[PDB]
Amino acid sequence: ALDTNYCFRNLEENCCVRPLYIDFRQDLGWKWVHEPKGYYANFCSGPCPYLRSADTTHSTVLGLYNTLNPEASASPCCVPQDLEPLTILYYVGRTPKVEQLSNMVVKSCKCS
């Protein structure tokens, strides 16, 4: 897998994890999230050449197809491999509520 320790260290054009900060209010319009104000959600971006962290057999097949035929406009896509949860705080009425939301932060990307 292509993780943050490799993607943020040496930057490259091909499929990799890329930094993205999201302010709940300024970017999503969520005025209900009390804590935190924002978070690094990140995303996946970049083309998928042959054998670059291919997801399935189809990813390997379609990947090879785009290697010998790059003008076919069909290729595997840079997509999150595994994700991490974010812990948020919000108020319901008077009582504060702490929740942990899974699959919020990208840490690795693959080619599907």
């Binding site: 005025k31 009390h34 108020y91 319901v92 009425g93 008077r94």
Partner: protein
Amino acid sequence: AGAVKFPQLCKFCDVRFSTCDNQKSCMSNCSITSICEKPQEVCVAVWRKNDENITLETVCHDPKLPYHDFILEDAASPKCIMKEKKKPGETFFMCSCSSDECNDNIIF
């Protein structure tokens, strides 16, 4: 079909000391934006000043239920427009509004 009535976002700091004095517009300075507990609840802002100092109240509250022994007309309004209430030796003001964080901007 029984569509779920969803509660609103209001400032919910309750009784807090405020610097809001002799002004046409005031910010609540309430860091707590809360999803109201009950679906029909609306935003409320109460401004009180005696001989000493000023207090501002921010709450979610049921429209057809008395707060400080007062009714809640104009609760369907999207903005919080304050209206004076008669109390002996007590300067009283209250607004009710049905919009997300509408009680953050208090208008006199």
